[PDB]
Design a protein around this ligand. Structure first.
Ligand code: 91A
Ligand code: 91A
Ligand code: 91A
Ligand code: 91A
Lengths: 289, 293, 289, 293
């Protein structure tokens, strides 16, 4: 067995040794260590070529990695972390919750600010209401195009296809969804219209009615990704995002007690996720380039 | 300024008095008291006489307060399913909103029971906290569901039905035809149910597999988006009672009951397991006014 | 096995049936049900006469019940709940944390108020600073008497003996510690001087030095209570209070994940404890009178 | 107003830059950044030159900032024991405060290791979260401890020593005589340790049993009360770093790191497991200034 032992700062500030020593530190530090091993196993599996027997828009690899996250993390600076992974094709499918799309898009038009625990407060973050007004103006012409394409070109819209379209339109390398569509990484979000984006789609529908967003074609798409995977890796940030995974890491502060080798790290992902990425995907950056 | 004071058991045990004294006990007990006041205000507003079905596209008549009841699926797996069913049965709320699993966990309880365990896969058991759902429950549900999905596809392609999650949930409640079901009562009383995440869990798995045996089902969320937002927009007053987190995204009255934290990102929040608190809340509010409904 | 089933309000508001139905409701409601059974088992054991073989200031019963609680609950209205139990000899030993003594005593001099989440805020409670000034005035002459008794009568003070003395002095039936000393229920609290009471003892010690509070005699006293018990019941509210129990109920919101048939109810005790007492000790009130 | 922005890994991996970017990431990452600023301010104040041992009754010289380091015993069972030991070893803090178990869990690690398990009684194992302490560790500690307690009683009754928890902790650290021990370094560097709850756990069990074999030990808390309060009162400036809850009851700088909640009842709180956060905090603060100490 492994002895409990924390990093000894008499050795100086050796950051890599420090991060490795979380594994033997105990409690959630140990879980962070296990999360690093689990994600490195997904990456190692993913970079392993498909054998001649295992062969199949996005090409299949030896490990399909699903990255899920709640909207709050897209409001946070973890948006940059997720965008980096998507940009370099390190994950294959994104899943998110109400708000998780528009909050990325809105940051390309106006910044989010730090406050404290016309303003939309999200934890200690501040989104001025003018951000959402700018977003409305940008969005409306796109929605007119989408309804026209539905009615005159037989386009059958789903949340994922809509998200891809919004990513193409924002046309900005800081956007998670710009990179997702450019790299053919599908984004699933049945709760896409539950928040502000949904409010705008709602008002738009009275000037220009009939937009259909089907979730059943998306249901087929996401499940086929899971079913045809050689191996599956899950990285889920925050709770309430998804409902067998060969590798899995969950990072959230949800409790089990009210009913709400897989690894759970009980921590705010805003602290843990960048450290996790530093020791995993960022070490194998060239292999993905 | 109210003094802190707890119920004195030298009075004996009067449960009404015990529950009222939560108000002056402090911490979440006080929030519970504030939640009772807030829900009672909703009810009183709902009951006071009103002195556009085209705009709402709904058959349910407007009252002076539209109450939205939101809840996570785990609460339906629990006995809070009975609490919710009762409110729905007697038309005490106007709109339901739930999360992935929140529909099928109710319907499956009509076919077979959920059991109490403790805080599995080789025996075929889906654990939800200290609750146990045998996998055979889901198999029974699947068999029940398939022919209904067949009818739904046929009605869509030949009777022009445009399905959405809410219309599906209504159909499933009518089909289950069982007075213990939330969704049976909801459709009977024209209380719509919204759940964009309807297909994220087991029910979705079954719909997915069904779609290869019988392709064609479309579930539109935009028509539901209009229905739920028109309910809010054309309300005279709105009340919100939301159990667990992540259900909904101005409300004149609002009560939230959950144990989610604020730190990783007058409305009343009670920081508590709704399985304890919600039946106490119902007892001191809706259940006191049963006659008026 | 037991089927999950919540209370059905079509039966009307039958409070006792409602409380019983928590047992089959699931999650923490089920734990509340288990807590009720566990505490009723302690009480039943306690009211059972000592057999002729089992015989021993406080007389031993068939079950010694330890009631522990954090200071915050004494600031809350749960102070009334605890006081009721102590008043009628339903528990045998109290254990508490820093502040848990003085907050009871101070309420006999001035009230605590409700605020929101010169004022000492405790959660959503408010203690005006003038409360602590009144307490200081009341306390100083008592501390002079205590030092005199130590030096001229050989009194060897410990936290428990001090707490008993303060309870006798407050001489008020609303006080937990008045009833504890009257009924010979010892109160243990090594952290007695960590807060405001300690601040006053500290300043007092420069006008009138030499007060000794020994924790070792208390160590012996509390452990002997545990060792000589026929049966032991633990009821612990909040975390960090104590460190084999035949019956045990813990009510707190502490998590396991950072390392901080016994039953744990994960809930604010301000909600749960009065309901627990209603269905347990309060049902057997006459047997204790 | 600072814009929300996370570390961009297109820069590659610079750990200093990564940790600085926590400040602008939001939620607890931002609090971490604020914690680094706050601790760095303490250190800078401590290091700036000072231009009453009678009143404190202490041998440790005053600096321009007295830093109190508080921590719960579970952190000593973890590897954070090493982090704390390092700070104590290099005199970077002035006063330690801990909770029941916080002394013996350090001393026992000098006799035998704590192991990693997972989140027992028949094998003889005390589980602390995902940590495992074999019961034999406590037996070894007991045997080591008894003759020291004998000496302590004799010194009390014949050399007039007036024992308190802090003086006991110092004696135990001197006896363990091992540079991996927090308490060894604390006594060597005249950093006092306060723990009124010293006897609530295993160490107390042993003291209790010892007291029948060799009666007479007195542990006074009032003399410790004076010592700790005089440290605070005669500080030029005070800094507080408190890990886990329930340790202490004006501070010029204060950082708290724990996962306790406010709901059942500029200082910086980081809502996080200190096993993750504290080594990162130390890396960006005290460990950057090692030379100055
Ligand atoms: C972990 C994944 C690979 C599998 C599970 C299977 N129950 N699954 C699939 C369906 C689904 C959706 C969904 C539904 C409809 C449209 N778009 C998105 C969102 S989360 C989720 C989900 O968990
Ligand atoms: C609190 C309500 C009255 C208003 C808010 C407005 N942002 N709103 C409406 C849209 C919506 C949905 C939705 C979306 C699409 C289909 N079906 C359901 C689920 S929750 C939610 C939600 O919060
Ligand atoms: C559960 C009880 C019956 C047993 C445990 C045994 N480790 N125990 C006893 C010692 C003790 C104290 C203590 C210490 C010194 C003076 N006064 C109070 C406070 S809590 C506690 C504690 O948990
Ligand atoms: C934050 C400090 C500098 C000040 C506060 C003042 N209320 N204070 C001092 C007394 C004290 C103890 C104490 C008590 C007796 C013996 N030994 C230790 C433990 S924590 C604590 C505590 O918070």
């Amino acid at each position: 067995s492994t002895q409990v032992r924390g990093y000894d700062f008499n050795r100086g500030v050796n950051y890599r040794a420090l991060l490795e020593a979380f594994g033997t530190t105990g409690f959630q530090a140990t879980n962070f260590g296990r999360a690093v091993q689990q994600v490195n196993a997904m990456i190692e599996k993913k970079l392993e070529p498909l054998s001649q027997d295992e062969d199949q828009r996005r090409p299949l690899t030896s490990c399909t990695i699903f990255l899920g996250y709640t909207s709050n993390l897209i409001s946070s600076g973890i948006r940059e972390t997720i965008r980096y992974l998507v940009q370099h094709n390190m994950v294959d499918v994104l899943v998110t919750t109400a708000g998780g799309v528009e909050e990325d898009l809105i940051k390309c038009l106006a910044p989010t600010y730090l406050g404290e625990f016309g303003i939309n407060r999200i934890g200690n973050l501040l989104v001025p209401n003018e951000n959402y007004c700018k977003f409305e103006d940008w969005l409306m012409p796109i929605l007119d195009q989408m309804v026209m394409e539905q009615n005159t070109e037989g386009v059958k819209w789903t949340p994922s296809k809509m998200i891809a379209r919004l990513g193409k339109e924002i046309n900005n390398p800081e956007s998670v969804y710009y990179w997702a569509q450019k790299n053919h990484i599908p984004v699933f979000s049945p709760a896409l219209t539950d928040g502000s984006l949904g409010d705008m789609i709602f008002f738009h529908s009275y000037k220009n009615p009939g937009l259909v967003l089907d979730i059943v074609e998306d249901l087929r798409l996401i499940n086929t990704q899971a079913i045809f995977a050689k191996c599956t890796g899950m990285i889920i940030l925050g709770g309430g995002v998804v409902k067998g995974a060969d590798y899995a890491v969950y990072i959230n502060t949800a409790q089990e007690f009210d009913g709400s080798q897989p690894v759970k790290v009980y921590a705010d992902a805003s602290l843990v996720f960048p450290l996790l990425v530093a020791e995993t995907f960022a070490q194998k950056m060239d292999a993905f380039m």
